[PDB]
Structures are given as structure tokens and as C-alpha cells.
Design a protein around this motif. Structure first.
Motif, short mmCIF file in Angstrom:
data_model
loop_
_atom_site.label_atom_id
_atom_site.label_comp_id
_atom_site.label_asym_id
_atom_site.label_seq_id
_atom_site.Cartn_x
_atom_site.Cartn_y
_atom_site.Cartn_z
N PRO A 44 -34.34 26.29 -12.81
CA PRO A 44 -33.54 26.15 -14.03
C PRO A 44 -32.12 25.64 -13.82
CG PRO A 44 -33.77 28.44 -13.44
CD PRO A 44 -34.80 27.69 -12.66
N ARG A 50 -35.49 36.76 -23.67
CA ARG A 50 -36.29 36.68 -22.45
C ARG A 50 -35.51 36.05 -21.30
NH1 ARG A 50 -41.80 33.94 -24.93
NH2 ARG A 50 -42.50 35.65 -26.29
N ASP A 51 -34.29 35.60 -21.56
CA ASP A 51 -33.47 35.00 -20.51
C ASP A 51 -32.42 36.03 -20.09
OD1 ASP A 51 -31.92 33.55 -18.78
OD2 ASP A 51 -31.46 31.94 -20.22
N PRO A 52 -32.66 36.69 -18.95
CA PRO A 52 -31.78 37.72 -18.39
C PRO A 52 -30.32 37.33 -18.22
CG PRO A 52 -33.06 36.77 -16.67
CD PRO A 52 -33.67 36.28 -17.96
N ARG A 88 -42.33 40.45 -11.89
CA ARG A 88 -41.94 39.11 -12.31
C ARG A 88 -41.40 38.41 -11.06
NH1 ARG A 88 -42.26 40.67 -17.77
NH2 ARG A 88 -41.29 39.19 -19.21
N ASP A 93 -34.24 41.64 -14.05
CA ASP A 93 -35.05 40.60 -14.68
C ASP A 93 -34.94 40.61 -16.20
OD1 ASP A 93 -37.92 40.60 -12.35
OD2 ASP A 93 -35.82 40.02 -12.15
N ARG A 94 -34.24 41.60 -16.73
CA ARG A 94 -34.10 41.73 -18.17
C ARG A 94 -32.70 41.45 -18.73
NH1 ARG A 94 -35.38 46.45 -18.18
NH2 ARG A 94 -33.66 47.63 -19.14
N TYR A 111 -35.89 34.03 -29.95
CA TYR A 111 -36.49 35.01 -29.05
C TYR A 111 -36.39 34.57 -27.58
CZ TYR A 111 -39.95 31.38 -29.00
OH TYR A 111 -40.53 30.14 -28.82
N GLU A 112 -36.17 33.28 -27.38
CA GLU A 112 -36.06 32.69 -26.05
C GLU A 112 -34.83 33.27 -25.32
OE1 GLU A 112 -38.93 30.81 -25.27
OE2 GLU A 112 -38.25 28.81 -25.86
#
Ligand SMILES: NC(=O)c1ccc[n+]([C@@H]2O[C@H](COP(=O)([O-])OP(=O)(O)OC[C@H]3O[C@@H](n4cnc5c(N)ncnc54)[C@H](OP(=O)(O)O)[C@@H]3O)[C@@H](O)[C@H]2O)c1
Ligand SMILES: NC(=O)c1ccc[n+]([C@@H]2O[C@H](COP(=O)([O-])OP(=O)(O)OC[C@H]3O[C@@H](n4cnc5c(N)ncnc54)[C@H](OP(=O)(O)O)[C@@H]3O)[C@@H](O)[C@H]2O)c1
Ligand SMILES: NC(=O)c1ccc[n+]([C@@H]2O[C@H](COP(=O)([O-])OP(=O)(O)OC[C@H]3O[C@@H](n4cnc5c(N)ncnc54)[C@H](OP(=O)(O)O)[C@@H]3O)[C@@H](O)[C@H]2O)c1
Ligand SMILES: O=C([O-])C(=O)[O-]
Ligand SMILES: O=C([O-])C(=O)[O-]
Ligand SMILES: O=C([O-])C(=O)[O-]
Ligand SMILES: [Cl-]
Ligand SMILES: [Cl-]
Ligand SMILES: [Cl-]
Ligand SMILES: [Cl-]
Ligand SMILES: [Cl-]
Ligand SMILES: [Mn+2]
Ligand SMILES: [Mn+2]
Ligand SMILES: [Mn+2]
Ligand code: NA
Ligand code: NA
Ligand code: NA
Ligand code: NA
Ligand code: NA
Lengths: 555, 555, 555, 62
Positions: A129, A8-10, A107, A68-69, A4-5
């Protein structure tokens, strides 16, 4: 990475574009509805969502969330109709976004470094990151467009600039870093605003400020390398120049508002010369404003004029400036060393219209964020002294445009040559002829310059880089474009324009041995083209393959 | 946890509420603007964002995104004004969202199991980040509210229910799993809809469907444990009943549409008895509809009457039903075993008004999703043969409500006792008195039943649980409430009512030895209170503390 | 990072050296016994554990396991007594380890690329945790020391070499990658060995082999950059030379066996000249062996002699070689283009002793891995026609050394100048004087050469680099060193020597503009010193600090 | 989960018993020598390592 990570990482998320087998291997099968689609389908859905909105701010927020998605999809939509979405993600909507940044906030994006974090910048970059950054657009928010000090709400700009870095220039998103240097804000209204997201105290100046900036530069280049491109954006006058001068030769850096605007400004005049049928050194330029944009543009014009064979002295004599106190003349009070450069022998004057009548310029450039400074009278006067006057309403956003395309063409009998920083729709003159006013905006310069610098690793950026880039742009303006009133190549071709600017910058870098990327590519265009971002989704399936059977047997 | 991944985890994300110390220790200092604020401040911005919206659909997306970004904040906002936000997260807006799920879709939520995943459910449950789940709300989307078959678009419902699990019940969000079992859809419109997110084919029925369900139940209980609560929601008539009867005694499960509705409906009548001053055995109920809701409610009513002293046979005789074919009478055509249970000796009838005038009931319950079935006529008739008629417009969403609060109160001269599945604003009668119609919706029952079952680990849920829960809810209706026209305690007190429902269920469970949580708590209320979800943020600072010094020395 | 994961990462794991505060913040408090110690304390326990062992293979395994547990501690131990641990981690124990690699194996180390992985190498480089590698040591295991084809068991060599990159050179361990290219093995014994960990088939040769190598070099430099240092180690003769010649000018690569050995061998001769009191052009060299080492050394010697003023032809006349077929003379059968280079007019000879008596060389170098080739007779003969003969038993491991330090000194009556590839204990001559035979081993060259290339990013390594490096090393041999019989600086000073090697390589790299790291440091020695690996543990405490209190205020 | 992190977790680590396919999907192909063995082949190598020891404390440590 997996699970699922990923969703959430665009940078990784493909949404429902994830293959049944990708989902199964990524351990996300079941976390997405049972339908698979391509970018085109996804783009469709976004447009339905964009169509139904009823406010630019809402359109902005919609796109920011997309960004952001799903990174790829965001840029896919952006490049799908650049003329339509740029006004939302960039000027003029981006200014509206900064004005309500606290409200539009959802966000977080970017890196916020505070004057209170001095001595700890290096650590904060770790928080980011990505460890491999090639470009950075930084601002302290003191001069957000022609909107003033918007403090931390100014983060909207760097984000917008970088959006074009990718959308119009092809620079990979993941390698860019938008940065906000909040040292406070002098904007009383913000200090009282309950939604303000920045430090609630007047801007910290002096030695403290200066040391913050030195640490920032030192920290960034230490982590990311000396080749990291640092683009200053929307800083106040004094800071903008001193900082540029201070780091220009020490790091790979440049100021967009000072140099990027100059590049695009000259690119338009160079193009305009094909309409006015004369030499740049035959013109007489008048600036409404004498700051970053004016001084930057004026300097490039002089270099361009010398290139024609005129002397430095003669060139400067054809440039006039007007600041908040009036026409800049020799011996006038309240003058800076930089302004004094264009202080000519002349009586003092304050009224802009009288100044236009007195100086009778061939080029009127507006860079003072003064509403409709270019009144019908002024415009009429220009159409009176000039067969084809050149009018540049460069202030941004739209509400600050010295004048509109409509009025420009209306009050100059369709003989005025127009350009503006913010977009205007085509105008159909009474004769039935439709003119397409060009956008003199950094957006034509910074994306390519970045693609270029990053490609060959130009160590430092001299003013010659922008002059040359001004020429590359103008060289892309077709006769057809010119006949429609365009001083710049159509926006839809911006990417191609950026590539050329990048290739040209590389050729010169290697020639003057200022480059850093080695060995040198046998074919620069081919090399850069292969370094450009791709809208397409990657395949997340494991690279499976078989070994002969003997060697693969289990003992 | 760590770095930026924390900001993307809604269960963890605290947004700008993270302290400087927390951000520094979480390696996210710099990723958030330089301002620290409390929940109140955060809720304020959310409201300023909610206020400017101009569509229910939009307000929905706003909240949904909030839920995908900051869990604590999301629930802090819902309970801050339950009466204002529940309509957005739950009925009726949730119905509108389902209708346009494809459009409203942003980030996926829940687990989507397909008919084509038969034999692989076990693995898919692993794709779910949480390994510890105590509750599950499943739907196949065939009977979404009174909106019909909305296929995969029905996922919006389990998400709504669960929202209330937390907001109204105090059940911990992280322990709940919303699930969509997509085996197709018979909705020709959706199948052609380009935004449809589910399988594009007619629903698969027969043994394949049954196997899928059995596997699901097995998979879910093996992984999460037999005590895991499975709440069936919005399944079609046939499936709802057989599935309920098939797993009722084998797993910890119940059907919200049949049993939850029955409970709340009975709770309301029990309350109404204190206005009508008589006993439930004195009434005659007429149901418009003979489906899941009707049959369930009828069944509980019967139990309630028997508990009064009436016989099974006598109780049944007091209930009349009308289905698509008309009044259910003995020897009528198209009758199901369940329906023939309430088939009385009587002549066939189809006209609703004539049925009302013939049976002359004291209570009118609408559960057929028929627009404005309770017309002026019907309502006048009811107020004609009843001193104080009890009218229940339970169909959802609002657009399906048998009648409005305004209508009921006006056509019954203010003597009607109203209640509805969807919300209606206060009504001020000509007499000047303002009535506050109550909402007879599952929402008053499933949150508290879950808190109860989960807390004590009630193995199986018998009908007694719902009758007891109905008494509990009615017990919380004050005289003051009754005087205002409320057959249910105010919604702002729904958390406290759920607590009492849970406490009660627990006591019964231990008494009948059907509980599983041991040893049994000395104070069930105190125990449950401590098990309830908290809206407060946790502190993410590492637990640092010192040891003496000789023990802490480095050798 | 965080959690138990930290304890399992040798690059992070500090063991009980973790501060109480570090343990609490890293979430490992309780996972380690209640005691905190310094590196010294830790080294103490390691030494206790090393002391009790009774076999070299067991000492190897102990230290290898240390390396897989705590990186800093590992190198802290190595550098605490380099003369004691190097023989364990390097020659000769490493040769023993390789011969029993299957047996000594515990946890894997390095990258294993197979010939069956052609076309997927790039994918495999991803499997490697580090994305920033600056040096690689590769071997296919066909010529591991003088032990032959040890196939996949040869991984021990690259692991050993890199151990010294850090221990002797100061290069960061994490930036280095040991690689094994397994294409099979021709060793019948290993094919039958049940503990063999490589591919159980004869080596694949021809085009397939050459393609694998091309793909390797391309993938490694594409991912890690063209500046990545690639050190070829222990490849068979034919492959060694062609690979070196093929990539020499294309990538940043060199062959340790051919070039590194040459450098160290000439380094020793240069130093020896200060004892023999004459010029290099005055000697006559005789090689026992005509392969990688022989030809490489021979080549460097020639360059060295030309730098004295002698012509290339005259220099070549002073070098003689013997291979498996005997003395290399003009017109001799089975000669290679490279060997023919030293084929002098002379009658053929096969007996080494006779050859020594005939040629009467002043320098005897052994690089044929032939046991005790330098017999007492040969050693006596050498001391007969040379006042002070120079004897180099360079073959490794110790069991392959042409002769022992004791034997050399005994049979030359203490007049022979000795050096060997593998370590030999000091020798006390009958006169009472104690001599310390030097170790002519690559270990003196590659560490410093690597530190140098990596530091300034030298694009390609020409032979000049090795010749100058030889001069840098000889420069570090003091008068005292020489008087003890040392031809190389003491091992304990190897880190200081390596630094000098690196600073010199850098200086020349910028002079010849073959460097890549820019801007150029003003003080190269200071720059490189700052880049060297530190044996000290880092502090894992979060960088905590405060802001003023008004800016830290929570709303 | 995946990556070299799996080789370090004794609960997951299979050593060279990891299949070529497993290694490719786990992102560890190349971190292990080019050999695939069953548990018994692994037990055999453990026994050879056990045998050569000459101290109970050493066998304990192994
Ligand atoms: N690519 C583009 O289209 C582009 C790029 C960059 C900037 N711009 C736009 O240019 C505008 C200014 O930017 P900048 O960087 O030049 O800012 P700046 O450095 O603050 O310069 C503004 C100048 O306007 C002068 N001014 C103020 N009132 C005046 C008045 N009433 N009459 C005449 N002059 C007046 C000021 O005078 P004093 O010297 O007396 O203060 C100042 O010199 C902004 O609206 C910005 O959006 C456009
Ligand atoms: N807490 C609450 O407020 C709550 C809870 C649950 C359900 N509901 C509502 O109740 C409604 C139905 O749910 P359900 O599960 O009972 O659905 P269902 O199983 O489909 O039952 C619907 C029933 O209405 C009958 N019917 C349809 N049209 C009719 C008509 N024109 N005249 C008379 N009878 C007619 C049907 O007859 P046949 O049997 O002849 O087909 C059927 O028996 C929904 O709109 C839902 O929103 C409310
Ligand atoms: N830094 C150091 O100290 C260092 C570095 C590298 C290598 N070495 C050592 O040097 C030795 C050779 O390695 P290499 O890389 O040069 O290998 P290589 O290329 O295989 O060369 C071996 C040479 O020895 C010759 N030879 C074999 N038997 C002989 C004999 N009985 N008499 C005379 N010559 C004989 C071979 O002859 P043919 O050509 O006729 O087969 C061949 O020319 C190894 O033992 C190695 O450990 C030491
Ligand atoms: O400053 C500005 O207005 C810009 O760069 O567009
Ligand atoms: O089905 C419904 O409408 C409900 O459960 O509220
Ligand atoms: O191969 C060898 O012997 C060496 O590298 O020392
Ligand atoms: Cl999608
Ligand atoms: Cl041993
Ligand atoms: Cl041996
Ligand atoms: Cl030594
Ligand atoms: Cl330390
Ligand atoms: Mn700007
Ligand atoms: Mn329902
Ligand atoms: Mn070697
Ligand atoms: Na020992
Ligand atoms: Na090893
Ligand atoms: Na070259
Ligand atoms: Na020879
Ligand atoms: Na193994």
C-alpha cells in the motif's frame, strides 16, 4: 478516503473515538455503536481484555489484533506502560509467538518475498500500500533469537522490532516495512508441521540466495530511494557478515545483531566503569560464543579501548572467546578469519569453568544461547577474582539467558554487576537493598539510530555511529541509576534516550557531510522532535471555511 | 476487486487460499505468506485455535473475529460441526456475549440506528456497503432472551440469528442486515457500566418511539423494496405485539419470538402425538408464562386443533396460563385482552405445583424464564397423571431453562417427553437406553421461512405459514428419531429441513397468488436449491479468453 | 487501476489501443469497440479530425480534449510534427485560447488557488491527485504574453508551458502541476464578460497578495519538497522582479519571462556573432521596451560581454533602452532603479525612428508588445548603418511582433538577421535563396532547464545557469543552420537540445555541489536519458509467472 | 464517493455548478475555477459553443 473502508484500515480507524460529525462526513454513521470516547477510555477497555487473559501467547495475539485494528490505539497502549507490554510484543513473548506463528496467525502483516520470486521483486513492492517507506527490517529466519531456524515463522521478529521503532524511537509506523525472505527452512520439525506457513523445502543457498538478496536491495532502494534504511535481523552467521560487508558502503544499511548489540553492550560497560572505578582498557573480557554478537561486541570494545589511548594490538589481547569447540587459541583447528583475530597463545581448553579460572576475566559476556551456562561455580569464581565482576547474560529469549538476575546476585554475594538481553524483575538482596538489573538489548540502540538516520538521511552507517551511540546511552545513566544496579537508563525513558541518539547522529552526519536532508535545520533537536510520531488521533472533518460573500455568490 | 483492500473485505478475503495466480492478478502477492491451502487446511487451524481456548466467551470472540475476517471460512467452520459451534454462535453463549458485549467488542457489526437519528434513517441505510438487502433482523434490546433489557448490548442477537440464516437456512449472508434500534435502556446497571456501548439514558417511549419505527420500516422498504423481509426479534411484550399487528399486512414481516416460537412448539407437539398415540385435541396445555411466546404458541395450538376438527371455542378451553400474578382465570385482576382470551372459570391460584395438580395437564410448556420452575414435585406429578407427559423447558438461555434434560428424565422415570429452548447433552437412562432431547427453538423455523419468503417473494406472512411450517418440521421427524426421544429432526439435518420449509412456503405462495417472483419456477425445489449460499470460494482470476486472430490483430 | 475508471483517467487510458487481454483483466472488455490499434493508427484518426477543422480555436480545443482523454496519445501527436502542433498548443494560438478561455473551456485543468483561500493552500494541494510533483508553472494572469491582464483566462499559459516541458523537454507530465493564482483582475472587459471563470473583482494587492504568495511557496515545498521547481510565468513587472528576488535563493525557482527569455535572446546573439564575424563587445544594443524581458536580456548580455574580457561598466555602456516615456537617459523622469542602470548621458527622445538614427545600434530587440514597431523606415535605417543588422521581434503573440520575417528581409534587402518570439514561415528572397527565421522563444530554455534541475536537484538557479544554457544552445546551431538564416537549432531537434542543456546543468550542479540527487550518476547523459518521458504505452497485463510445482501445491 | 474521480463521472459531475461547500467536502476545491454558476448560466455557455459551429457533424460531436 471514506466509508466502511476506513474502519478496516488500522492506519485510519479510530473506532468509537470517531466524532458524530466525523462519522457523518465519513459515511460511517450507523456502523458504530452510539457512544463516543477518548483514547483513555479505549485504553481502559483494552486493559480489561488484557487482564482477563491467562497466557502470554493470548496476550500477544490480543495486542497483535489491536495493531491490526487501530494503529494509534495500539501504540497508545504500548507507550502507556512500556515495561509491561514490551515483554509481550518483544522479548521474550515474541519468540514464543514465532514458535507458534502458524497458530497465532490471524491477519497477515509485512511483505513475504520468496526465492521463487526472483526477478519480480520490484513488482511485489507495488503490492505494498505505502509507496513512501523510509525503513525496513528484514530477516530470512535462520537465526531467530537463540531459537534457531524458524523459517517463515520468523516474521514475528521484524514486526516486533518495528513495534519498538515507533514505541521506543518515535519513527512513524506507516513509513516502516517488515520483510520476510523465505528461501526455505532446514528445520525438519517445521517441514512436518501442518500449520507452517512458509515454503516446505530445505533452504536454498549459493548463487541463487545471493542474487535474491542483491535484487531485494536494488529493488527497495529504486522504489523507496537510496536513503531507505535497511536493517538486517536474525540472519545466520555467515550470511549476516558477508551481507553486511557487501552492502554496508553501497546502501544505508546495518545489521542489528552484529552492530546494534555491540552498541548496547559497550554502553553497559562504559556505564559499569563508574562502578568498577577503572578504565575499559584495564579489563579482560571473556565471551561465551564467538558469533555475530560476540564478534560485533568485541570489535566495538576494541574501538572504545583505543579511544582511551591504548593501541589496537593491546586492546585485542584483552579479549577472549569460546565457541562450540572450546577456547579460541592461536593455531587451533576450525577457526575463521574473524575468530583468528582473537586467537591468542594459550593451550586448548573446552570446559567453560576451567577457562574462567584460567583467564580470570573481569567481564563475562554470554552470547551463545546456552541455557544456564553461568553456573553458581562460574559466578562464584567471578566474585572471587573480581571485587565487582561484570556479568552479561545476553542470549534471548529468557529460556536462553546464561543466568538469572537472582542467581547472578545470589552467587556473587550481591557484588556482581548484571545485565541481560531479556527482562528480569528487581531483586532485593538479603541486606534489603533492591537492585534493578538492566536490559542489554538492541532495543536501546536501533530505535534511535533509525530516528537519526531517517532524520538527516545518513547515507551509510559506519562503526563510529554505534560507538558514539554507545556513549550517548551511557551518558544517560544517572548516579541514582548506577546505585540501583542499572547499567542503562530506565526503560520508561527510552524515548528520550532515542531522541538524544538521533540528535547526536544527525550532528555528526552534517559535520562529516554524510547527511542528505537539506538545508540543515538550525535546531536539530527541535527538528527531530517535530518529525516524531504522535499517539493522538487526527481530525477527519473536512477543512471547511467561507469566502467573502460576493466571491461565493452563485451566478 | 483490488489490492490489499481485498484482504480486509471478509466477503472477499480468501486468506492463504488465494492462488498464486489470483494473488498476482489481485495485486496482493507478497501480502500473504508463501503457502497455499484449501478450506480443510484452514478449518484445521481454526479448530486448533478453538481447542486451546478455555472459555465460552473466548471461543465466541474467536469465531466472531473469524466472521470479520473470512466469510466463506466462517460458515465453512460452523456447518462443519453445527452441533458444536451453534452453542457458541447462538444460545446460550450468545446470551453470555450480550451480557458482556462491551468487553467482547472488537470490530463493529450491523447497523445502529438511534432515536436521535429520526428523520435521517434513509441516509444512514446508504452508509451500509450493500444496496441489495433481502432480509433484516431488528431488535431494540429490551427483551434479550430471558436476560431482560440489555440495551445496545443486544446487537449480539440479530448477529446470531443471521448466522443461522446462512448456516441453517442457506440464505446468502451478503443480503442480510442485522439492526439495533437504540432508543436507550432502563437497565440501571448498564447505564453505570463503563463499557456500555449504547445511549446512556432511559428508553424513550411514546410517540417518538412509534415514529422511529414507522420511519425505519418506510426507509428500509423504499430502499430495499417492499419484498424485503423484516424480522422483529427480542422486543418487549407490548411493543412486540402492536408492532407485529401494525405492519403485519403492510410489509413482509413477522415476529420471531411470537410466531417463530409458536411454529417450533407446535412442530414438537405434532411429533409427540406419535408417541402419546392420541390427537392434539386430546391434550390440555398449561403455560408457565403468558407473554409473547406463550400467547403465540397458544394461538397456533388452537389453529392446529381446529384443523383436527375441534371448534374454536373447544380448542381454547384446552389451554391454561399462569403469569406473574398467578393462574389466569375469568374475572381475575390485572388481565390483558389477549390474556382474558384464555381466562377460564376457576378459582385464583398462585402456587405453580398446586396449579399443576389442579389442572392436571398433559403438556407443560415453560416460557417465563423462571430458573428451575419445573421442580422434582412438578415433574413427578406430571409423570403421575400422564402415561407420557410432554415437558417443554423453552426459556433461554440455559440458566433460565425451566428444568434440565437429566432432571426431566429422572423425575418422570424416563416416561417424560422433553424439549428445551437451549441445548442439553444426551441422557442415558438407568435402563441403559440413551435419549437425545430435542431443541424446541426458533432456529428450526426462521431460517427456512426466510429462504422461503425471499425465494418466492411472499408479500405478507400470515399465521397459516407457521402452522404449515410446523407440519413440515414434524414431517421430518423419523420413527427412529422418535424412538430416541427427539421431537425434532437431528440438528445436523437442519439445512435440508429448511429447504423443505422453503419449498413448501413457495408452493403455497404461488397457489394463493401471494408470491412475487415470476415467472414461477417449473421446479420450485431445483430453483431454491440453486438460490442457496455456497461455502465454496469463488475464483478471482480474470476471465481471459481469445478471439480468432485476424479480429484480435492490432492496426 | 481497474474498471471504467481507467478509461476516464487520461494518464492511464489507452483507448482502443488496449489489448484484448488487457481489457479482460482491467474489466473494461465490452466498453470499447471490437478493434485494436496502434498509436500510429490512432494518430491517423486524430490528424483526420484536425484536418477537417477550419479555425485555430477549434484546433486548440480538439487537442486540449485529446490531452484530457489520452495523455500518451496527446504527446505522441505533438512530437510527431512539432512545427505543426506547437503553434496550436503554444504561441500564437494559446494567446487566442486565453482570450476566449471561457468559451473554449470544457473540462478543468490545473490548480486554481484564490486569494480568498489564504491559510488553506496546504489543504488544496491534497485535492490534487498526484502527491509527487517536481515542477510547477505559476501565473496570476496579469501579463499574459502581450495581451495584458487576462485574469483567470490566463490558465492557458501554464498548461501550454508544461505541454512543452514534456513535448520539447522530455519531462514526465504527471510530475508537473500548472497553477493559477486568482486574486482578481483589473480588466473591465472580463469583469463584464458572462463567460469569465475567475473572480469578478479588481485585483487584490498589497500585503494580502504578498502573504498569499508566501503561503503558496511554503505549502508547495512542504508537501512536494524543497527541490520542487517553481517556474513563475506571466506576472506583472513589479511583482515579477520582487517575487524572483524574494525566493531566488530560498527555493528552487526562476522567472521564465525575465530569465528564460534572457537566455534564449543571448543564445541567438551568440550564434549571430558567427555571421557578423565579430565579438559581442563590438555591438550596441537597443531595446524597444524596458521591462521583464528587456532588463533580463540586458543583464545576461552584460554578463556575456564581461566573459569576453570587457568590464561591467564598459558593457553596460553598450546597452540602450526605450520605454513608454521614451529613451531612457540620465536624469529622465519616471525611472526605476533597474532602468537607471542603463540611463546614459544623452538628450531625451521619444520617437523610436529618431532614436534608431541617433544611437545607430547593431542589434535591435523588441520586447514592448508594440504592433509593427519596426517600421520599414527603421528596418531600412538598420540595414543602412549595419552591413548585417540583427533584428529580434520577440513580442508575442504574432499580432504583437515588432515586424514580420517578410518585412524584415524585404526592407533590409535580405541582409538583416532575424528572429522572433512567434513563428513565421520561411522566406524566399528575390535571389531565390530561402531563409528560415529562427524562433527566439523561452521554449528553447525552460524545457531543458527543467529537465536539468529536476534530474540533479539543483537547490537554486543562479544567472550563471541561464548564461551557460545560452552557450549550450548556440553550440547546437550548425554552419548549415546559420547559412539558412537560423539563429537557433531547428525545432525538430529541440528534444536533443534540451537534453544537452540538462546534462550541462547537472554537471555544473555536482561540480559546485549545489545538486541534491545522490549518489551522483557515473554517466550523467545516460542517467538523464533514462529519466525522460516515453510516448509509448505501458502494458497493463498482470505480472504473471509461476513457482516450482511443489511450492505452488495447495494443501 | 469523492475526489477528482467525481469530475470524471458524467452522472455526478456538476462542473462549476458545484458549491464551495460541495467542493470542499468532495475534496475537489481548487480543481475548478473560482466561479459558481447555475444550470442556466451553464446552458448559456453551451449555446454559445453550439452557435459558432458550422457543421451538423460538429454540433453532434459537441
Ligand atoms: N541485544 C541483545 O541482547 C542480543 C542481540 C543479538 C543477539 N543476542 C543473542 O545472542 C545469542 C547468539 O546470537 P549470535 O548472533 O551471536 O549467533 P551466532 O552467530 O550463531 O553465534 C552463536 C555462537 O555460540 C557458539 N556456541 C555454541 N555452543 C557453544 C558452547 N556449547 N560453548 C561455547 N560456545 C558455543 C557458537 O560456536 P561455533 O562458532 O562453533 O558455531 C557460535 O559462535 C542468541 O541467543 C541471541 O538471542 C542478543
Ligand atoms: N424458540 C425458543 O426456545 C424461544 C422463543 C421465544 C422466547 N423464548 C423464551 O421465552 C421466555 C419469555 O419470552 P417472552 O417473549 O414470552 O417474554 P415476555 O413477553 O416478557 O413474557 C414473559 C411472561 O412470563 C410471565 N411471568 C414472569 N414471571 C412469572 C412467574 N414468576 N410465574 C408465572 N409467570 C411469570 C410474565 O407475566 P406478566 O404478563 O404478568 O408480566 C409474562 O407473561 C424467554 O426466557 C425466552 O428465552 C424461547
Ligand atoms: N521568450 C519570448 O520570446 C518572450 C518572453 C517573455 C516576454 N516576451 C514578450 O515581451 C513583451 C513584454 O513583456 P514583459 O514581460 O517584458 O513586460 P513588461 O515588464 O510589462 O515590459 C513591457 C515594456 O515595454 C514598454 N513599452 C510600452 N510601450 C512602449 C512603447 N510604445 N515604446 C517603447 N516601449 C514601450 C514598457 O514601458 P513602461 O515601463 O514605461 O511601462 C515596459 O517597459 C511581451 O509582448 C511578451 O510577449 C517574449
Ligand atoms: O537477536 C536478538 O535476540 C535480539 O535482537 O534481541
Ligand atoms: O428469545 C429467545 O430466546 C429466542 O428467540 O430463541
Ligand atoms: O510571455 C511570453 O511571451 C513567453 O513566455 O514567450
Ligand atoms: Cl473503539
Ligand atoms: Cl480561431
Ligand atoms: Cl489580439
Ligand atoms: Cl525551426
Ligand atoms: Cl506504444
Ligand atoms: Mn535480533
Ligand atoms: Mn428471540
Ligand atoms: Mn511568458
Ligand atoms: Na485544419
Ligand atoms: Na487549457
Ligand atoms: Na541559498
Ligand atoms: Na538607455
Ligand atoms: Na460548468
Amino acid at each position: 478516503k471514506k466509508g466502511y473502508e476506513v474502519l478496516r484500515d488500522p492506519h485510519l480507524n479510530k473506532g468509537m473515538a470517531f466524532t458524530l460529525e466525523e462519522r457523518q462526513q465519513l459515511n460511517i454513521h450507523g456502523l458504530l455503536p452510539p457512544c463516543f470516547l477518548g483514547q483513555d477510555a479505549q485504553v481502559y477497555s483494552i486493559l480489561k481484555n488484557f487482564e482477563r487473559l491467562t497466557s502470554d501467547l493470548d496476550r500477544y495475539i490480543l495486542l497483535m489484533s489491536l495493531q491490526d485494528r487501530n494503529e494509534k490505539l495500539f501504540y497508545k497502549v504500548l507507550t502507556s506502560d512500556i515495561e509491561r507490554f514490551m515483554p509481550i510484543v518483544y522479548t521474550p513473548t515474541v519468540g514464543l509467538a514465532c514458535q507458534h506463528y502458524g497458530l497465532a496467525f490471524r491477519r497477515p502483516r509485512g511483505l513475504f518475498i520468496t526465492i521463487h520470486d526472483r526477478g519480480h521483486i520490484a513488482t511485489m513492492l507495488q503490492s505494498w500500500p505505502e509507496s513512501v517507506i523510509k525503513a525496513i527490517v528484514v530477516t530470512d529466519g535462520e537465526r531467530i533469537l537463540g531459537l534457531g531456524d524458524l523459517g517463515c515463522y520468523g516474521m514475528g521478529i521484524p514486526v516486533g522490532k518495528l513495534a519498538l521503532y515507533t514505541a521506543c524511537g518515535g519513527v512513524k509506523p506507516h513509513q516502516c516495512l517488515p520483510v520476510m525472505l523465505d528461501v526455505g527452512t532446514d528445520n525438519e520439525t517445521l517441514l512436518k508441521d501442518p500449520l507452517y506457513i512458509g515454503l516446505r523445502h530445505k533452504r536454498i543457498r549459493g548463487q541463487a540466495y545471493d542474487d535474491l538478496l542483491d535484487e531485494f536491495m536494488e529493488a527497495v532502494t529504486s522504489r523507496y530511494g537510496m536513503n531507505c534504511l535497511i536493517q538486517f535481523e536474525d540472519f545466520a552467521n555467515a550470511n549476516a557478515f558477508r551481507l553486511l560487508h557487501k552492502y554496508r558502503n553501497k546502501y544505508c544499511t546495518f545489521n542489528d545483531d552484529i552492530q546494534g548489540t555491540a552498541s548496547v553492550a559497550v554502553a553497559g560497560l562504559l556505564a559499569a566503569l563508574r562502578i568498577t572505578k577503572n578504565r575499559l582498557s584495564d579489563h579482560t573480557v571473556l565471551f561465551q560464543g564467538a558469533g555475530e554478537a560476540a564478534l560485533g561486541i568485541a570489535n566495538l570494545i576494541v574501538m572504545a579501548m583505543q579511544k582511551e589511548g591504548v593501541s589496537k594490538e593491546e586492546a585485542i589481547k584483552r579479549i577472549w572467546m569460546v565457541d562450540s569447540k572450546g577456547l579460541i587459541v592461536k593455531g587451533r583447528a576450525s577457526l575463521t578469519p574473524e575468530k583468528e583475530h582473537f586467537a591468542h597463545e594459550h593451550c586448548e581448553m573446552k570446559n567453560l569453568e576451567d577457562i574462567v579460572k584460567d583467564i580470570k576475566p573481569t567481564v563475562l559476556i554470554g552470547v551463545a544461547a546456552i541455557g544456564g551456562a553461568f553456573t553458581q561455580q562460574i559466578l562464584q569464581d567471578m566474585a572471587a577474582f573480581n571485587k565487582r565482576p561484570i556479568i552479561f547474560a545476553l542470549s534471548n529469549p529468557t529460556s536462553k539467558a546464561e543466568c538469572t538476575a537472582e542467581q547472578l546476585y545470589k552467587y556473587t554475594e550481591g557484588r556482581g554487576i548484571f545485565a541481560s538481553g531479556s527482562p528480569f524483575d528487581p531483586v532485593t538482596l538479603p541486606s534489603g537493598q533492591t537492585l534493578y538489573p538492566g536490559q542489554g538489548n538492541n532495543s536501546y540502540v536501533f530505535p534511535g539510530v533509525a530516528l537519526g538516520v531517517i532524520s538527516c538521511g545518513l547515507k551509510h552507517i559506519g562503526d563510529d555511529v554505534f560507538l558514539t551511540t554507545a556513549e550517548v546511552i551511557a551518558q544517560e545513566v544517572s548516579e541514582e541509576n548506577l546505585q540501583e544496579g542499572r547499567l542503562y537508563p530506565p526503560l520508561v525513558t527510552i524515548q528520550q534516550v532515542s531522541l538524544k541518539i538521533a540528535v547526536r547522529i544527525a550532528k555528526e552526519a552534517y559535520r562529516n557531510n554524510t547527511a542528505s536532508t537539506y538545508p540543515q535545520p538550525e535546531d536539530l533537536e527541535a527538528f527531530i522532535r517535530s518529525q516524531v510520531y504522535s499517539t493522538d488521533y487526527n481530525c477527519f472533518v473536512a477543512d471547511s471555511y467561507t469566502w467573502p460573500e460576493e466571491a461565493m455568490k452563485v451566478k
